[PDB]
Structure prediction request, 144 residues.
Amino acid sequence: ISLCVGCGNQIHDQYILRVSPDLEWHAACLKCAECNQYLDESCTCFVRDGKTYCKRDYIRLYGIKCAKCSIGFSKNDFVMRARSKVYHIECFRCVACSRQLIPGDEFALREDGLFCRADHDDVMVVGEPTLMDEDERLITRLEN
Ligand SMILES: [Zn+2]
Ligand SMILES: [Zn+2]
Ligand SMILES: [Zn+2]
Ligand SMILES: [Zn+2]
Prediction:
């Protein structure tokens, strides 16, 4: 037998959807925990804290995302760092003078945001921009 993890009842459909490892689902019960959408549409889905998510919602909630615009990154995107906070090369602006920061600029991360060594007045030296799966899991459609 196989008990659908979403609802607990037996799966009598022609195919059983398995989130790796060992999570068997009714196709209708495999929903994004936030947007409610069937995750059958995709090869993969994300699984944290016992909830199952689609990428958009995953990244938007748990993924690495940008400290300014609050939007996730593309696998080949190049990001500027601040101690703990990654940033879109386009969004690495001083929030006060609203202008770009470059490798070799004195700068500082304040609660309000990034500030250049002029609008600040701890201080740092802006660094070189850089390019770039733990909770991600494979969806397989097993025949019943
Ligand atoms: Zn079910
Ligand atoms: Zn979603
Ligand atoms: Zn950004
Ligand atoms: Zn500034």
Q: What stands out?
A: The helical segments are 55-61.
